[PDB]
Amino acid sequence: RVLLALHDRAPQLKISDDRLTVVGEKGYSMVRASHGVRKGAWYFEITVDEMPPDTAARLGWSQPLGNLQAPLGYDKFSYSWRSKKGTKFHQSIGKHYSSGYGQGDVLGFYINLPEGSEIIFYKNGVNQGVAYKDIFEGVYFPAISLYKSCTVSINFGPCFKYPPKDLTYRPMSDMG
């Protein structure tokens, strides 16, 4: 019920029939999920199915105005985590955050929007730290940006590969 949005995606990205897998094409471009969140704590996972050394992803959360024809984290509307070097991006500013991630990894994506906000990334069940705090108010959508022909699969829940031990949340699938 919660899926990659067909109406809200860069045309060059290749979306699977089940709308849970996406393949990138050349320069960065983005797709958002069909549902977003404004309040409370929420979670989803992305698995990197394939990612050769020349490809890359920036994954995280975007409001509706985030530019689909640019990397996630490019403008004020999104916050992202780069596979290459584990850099965090927002308004096109890259900052050190964690170690990088790649093919085979299962990344977790936590947000908390009390109404104090926080974005936390996970790698294979391991909390990589609070990336951003007190973020721009608005509705946030799970988001995927890809560079070149890598492939990733998103899971909105309710069944996660590495359900975090250290905090409470609802699966994004609760919105569907």
Partner: peptide, 10 residues
């Protein structure tokens, strides 16, 4: 296009 094409420099 480069991976870092959009990124602001330090």
């Amino acid at each position: 296009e480069r991976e870092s094409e959009f990124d602001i420099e330090d």
